[PDB]
């Protein structure tokens, strides 16, 4: 079964930084066959229905503020906020989609 | 405009089940699988099992959490997703979530409210 690592568990900037957080899996989630990375990025706000950000690793969803991008490949990936919003308070999950569904176990991003 | 509205959760005795309903609107319902996922407090996003699209005749797979007690199916005729929940423990209490997914982007693209379930005697 697929291990999904985030790190750290929870982190804090300020309005308008810059932040990276990283995500791992135990096993390759890149395809040669169709060139893609099966790895999402999803924003759950605290008490509230979660939002796809990234899939394919670094393929931002329609509608999402550039601000957020995601990068790496294989079993390696990061999420990259470049200026920091109020409204990115939550917690950020990497996801695998290879093999079913395994979320990671969260980065909380609070604000100081 | 996609819509996906949860409903059908509460307070569940020990041991009992519960039906969880997810309705949709906004998209051909039939050309998308529909996930299940679930936060408990204090707890990170857990996802529970999906139902795939008619092309691929919409069989379903599980979490080795939840397989064997939980059962997915839909209702084509209504554009309805239901989450069969059977043999409840403490631990399954959390806001559950409908999702449309599938094999377009291999990601959980909309996400409906959620519904709220406690477990407790
Ligand atoms: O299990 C599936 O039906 C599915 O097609 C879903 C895709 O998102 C992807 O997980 C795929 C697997 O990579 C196997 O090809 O399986
Ligand atoms: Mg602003």
């Known amino acids: 079964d697929i291990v999904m690592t985030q790190s750290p568990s929870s982190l804090a900037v300020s309005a308008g930084e810059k932040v990276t957080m990283s995500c791992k899996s135990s096993q390759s989630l890149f395809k040669s066959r169709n060139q893609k990375n099966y790895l999402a990025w999803y924003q759950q706000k605290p008490g509230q229905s979660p939002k796809l950000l990234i899939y394919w690793a670094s393929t931002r969803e329609s509608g999402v503020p550039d601000r957020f991008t995601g990068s790496g490949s294989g079993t390696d990936f990061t999420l990259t906020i470049n200026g920091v919003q109020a409204e990115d308070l939550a917690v950020y999950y990497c996801?695998?989609?290879?093999?079913?569904?395994?979320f990671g176990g969260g980065t909380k991003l609070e604000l100081k | 405009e996609v819509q996906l509205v949860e409903s059908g959760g509460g307070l569940v005795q020990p041991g009992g089940s519960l039906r969880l309903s997810c309705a949709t609107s906004?998209?051909?319902?039939?050309?998308?699988?529909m996930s299940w996922v679930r936060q408990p407090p204090g707890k990170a996003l857990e996802w529970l099992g999906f139902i795939r699209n008619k092309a691929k005749g919409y069989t379903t797979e599980y979490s080795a959490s939840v397989k064997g007690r939980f059962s997915i199916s839909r209702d084509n005729s209504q554009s309805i997703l239901y989450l069969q929940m059977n043999t409840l423990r403490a631990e399954d209490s959390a806001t559950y979530y409908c999702?449309?997914?599938?094999?377009?982007?291999?990601?959980?693209?909309?996400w409906g409210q959620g519904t709220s379930v406690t477990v407790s005697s």
């Open positions: 906004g998209f051909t319902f039939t050309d998308y699988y």
């Open positions: 996801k695998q989609s290879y093999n079913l569904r395994t």
């Open positions: 999702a449309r997914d599938g094999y377009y982007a291999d990601a959980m693209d909309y």
